Structure 1
């Protein structure tokens, strides 16, 4: 029981998860630049990158298990190589995770229309809550950074780096 629009949509989500992994990887190595040097922001985003790779692998295994055929696409480069500040990176990540969430919600609605409860359950089990938690955590971080005066307050990002992300 597996539709072609479903196979295709899963393949599209695979690519999106790999893109998310790459964005986070880009931010991780931005924050270990010599003129940024926020080593816990770096570690934070590196860990998120690795999570996103696992998100992609889970969908690839789903595709294999349902007898679909994985069709990989180019992984697009992140839209910035200078992420400007710890606050700006967090805000960009929050938007990324909200766009990923809405793609997952779209995929869920497609699965519901197709009467594919196995795909709905897979998404609900592995993706939808983790996305909500991600979105909440990034939102938390953005709020704290703004309240502390980032990015122009000289100490906000340094102190956020050593305590919250430490």
Structure 2
């Protein structure tokens, strides 16, 4: 039987679906970059999309480990175009900060319910979000320095296209 509350189960399932959307949004940013011919930025976003799916499956396996079940929900259509390289990465940063706040909300729900197992499980994501946000902020700072000069933006398309 399920040892998380239905309310914590719902919060975790909601977050799983949010991570699925995150993966889909980053794939959409990849489609935009590929349409604009930045094959390295697109590669970076495809890798990010794969990473978000691993987040979703961590939520999946935790839900089942606590006796719950996962219900997949409809996936909203992501935006398909951005008003520039900066516009896309600013959207990514805004999205990741929203994901961080969502995880925070689950953590406090679990803590109020004295569900220490879920509180502890979420630590990994708190720490991971620190890094996700930082990587996007670093990219945005580089884009600010480039100031639209393609001499430099070529170098950064090439470097992010190196992501493993």
TM-score, length basis structure 2: 0.92
Where structure 1 has 5 or more consecutive residues not aligned to the other structure, the ranges are none
Question: RMSD in angstroms over aligned alpha carbons?
Answer: 1.3
Taking the aligned partners of 2:133 and 2:34, their CA distance within structure 1 comes to 24
Match of 1:21 in 2: 23
1:114–1:25 Cα change, 3 Å: same
Where structure 2 has 5 or more consecutive residues not aligned to the other structure, the ranges are none
Matches within 5 A, 1:1-166: 1-33=3-35, 36-78=36-78, 80-125=79-124, 127-150=125-148, 153-166=149-162
Taking the aligned partners of 1:137 and 1:143, their CA distance within structure 2 comes to 10
1:164, distance to aligned residue in structure 2 (A) = 4.9
1:12, distance to aligned residue in structure 2 (A) = 0.7
1:112, distance to aligned residue in structure 2 (A) = 0.6
SS at match of 1:32: helix
Taking the aligned partners of 2:152 and 2:5, their CA distance within structure 1 comes to 50
SS at match of 1:69: coil
Higher helix share: 2
Q: Matched residue pairs, number?
A: 160
SS at match of 2:46: helix
1:144, distance to aligned residue in structure 2 (A) = 1.0
Taking the aligned partners of 1:163 and 1:57, their CA distance within structure 2 comes to 29
Taking the aligned partners of 1:115 and 1:21, their CA distance within structure 2 comes to 31
SS at match of 2:12: helix
Taking the aligned partners of 2:131 and 2:157, their CA distance within structure 1 comes to 20
Do 2:41 and 2:161's aligned partners in 1 also have CA atoms closer than 8 Å? yes
Taking the aligned partners of 1:74 and 1:28, their CA distance within structure 2 comes to 21
